[PDB]
Amino acid sequence: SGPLPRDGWLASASDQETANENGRAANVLDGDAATLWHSRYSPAPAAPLPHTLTIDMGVVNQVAGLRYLPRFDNMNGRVGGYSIHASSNGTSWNLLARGTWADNADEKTVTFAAASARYIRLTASTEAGNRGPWSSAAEINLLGTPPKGPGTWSPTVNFPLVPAAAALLPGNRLLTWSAYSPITFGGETGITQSAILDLNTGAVSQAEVANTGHDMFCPGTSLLPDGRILVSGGSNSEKTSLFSPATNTWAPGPDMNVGRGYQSNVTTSTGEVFTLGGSWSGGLGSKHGEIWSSTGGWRPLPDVPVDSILTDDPGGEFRSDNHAWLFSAAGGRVFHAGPSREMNWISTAGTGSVTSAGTRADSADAMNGNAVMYDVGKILTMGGAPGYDNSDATARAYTIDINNGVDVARTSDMAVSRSFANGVALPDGQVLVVGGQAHAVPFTDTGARMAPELWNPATEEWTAMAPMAVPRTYHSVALLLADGRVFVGGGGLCGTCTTNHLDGEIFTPPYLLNADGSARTRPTIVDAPATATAGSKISVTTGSKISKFSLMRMSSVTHTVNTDQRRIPLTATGTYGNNTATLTLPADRGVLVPGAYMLFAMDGNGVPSVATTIQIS
């Protein structure tokens, strides 16, 4: 067995010193030979033997051994007699090994029969020289093999920047950007580093964007009906820039009435863009509603006040107006689902108005959690923390049904708690959750959740997927690709820090794999219209008989916010032709929000085709 990778591992103990030196449990995982876990010895009385050190791996690995690295500075607390326990579920534990280690500074190794475990506990019974009631350790490694499947990961893909915002383009290309710099941010320099990854060839084009005077770090994003991507606020808090995928260039838009950052933008049923909140930039507070049209620019909605969306963040309005969970709803309305406990109905006519939707059951505030629309008027919320900064994340998930009402229920908890994660609606109706960490501290990788999970509406259960290789915490992104795979990238963007990830990885979901790990034969779309109108009947030819399709709106994503994606399942009617079917698009543009969609054919095993692009008006 080689050592397992320790990304995301969290160490805790019976007792630990912090008064007389830094003896925290967490020091066994940092890789530094000079930093120790030491049992608590001050004040008197010192804590007595035995002492325990527990490791939560975040995942159910196969464990076949443990490596103990003693301190190098002196002999105090070198473990003598030892016990090793394992749990998969947290509650029942099993002995795998028991022994004694000699009184020297040599790294010790213990190997046993392979065991399925998320947790490994080391009990120290004696101090190898009986010098005192002490245990200590510089490093703990674990030997064995990580889970393979379900699903599979690509190798990492090199990026020339930290991809901290991202959008899917037609033609199987992915636009990403960072800030004025590939690896840091700040000021209002009016330049953004960008990179387009070609999903076919793996090639990356890098482009500095200076023509619109906009550093587009920390903005609101959405997809427009005509195909363009509107990006407003951020480091240049008043700017609007629009990206055209025909030209692959940016064009200046008009300024917002008030600058903002970390706000939420959402394309409405009319193809206008509504925005609310965002005190990260442009000033503190009063970040009330605005709406953009292409003919009139940004107009104020003074009767859409921010007060309704504010969480009880300890950081106040700087954080409490961040990253609202905004959705286009039937009828042309906007729905606010969170992260605040309080949910709202927003109307954009006139000066606007807000109506309370009541709370999200008994959820606490869920800042940096995800909300994902997996069907018509059906949303799944999950993860988040009551606070933006230094705050315990939750594993709780709540469903919300907004069809002719508001109906909230609590669903299954995730196997791990997450903040800073991303959510991705998949074509089969399931929802993937990716990344995040256990305790929200922006710019850290500590307690990163390495194994995505998949929620099946049919049973409301979460299933763990094969884990990825790079932690994806703050400033990470994930989104659906047209071949049905999921891109994950980014993390960090903190300058001389050691947590920048200038890469991504691509997840192949279980729906594309045979039991043996060979690629599943997929349905194929042979012919389909490239444009269509809400309420239209359209004709689709597949290469075999298909009766279920998914319209999946294309995504933009940053800082956990994705107002664009949504699943609209359609039932095919058979016609006279050879595996040619009719689909009927919903007439309601509140539901069928205009923009770029990926149309997917779903086979009887629920395997999806590669999608085709259809621009819906």
């Binding site: 530094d32 000079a34 690295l69 500075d73």
Partner: peptide, 6 residues
């Protein structure tokens, strides 16, 4: 591993 020193 690495070391920061004592």
């Amino acid at each position: 591993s690495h070391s920061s020193g004592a």
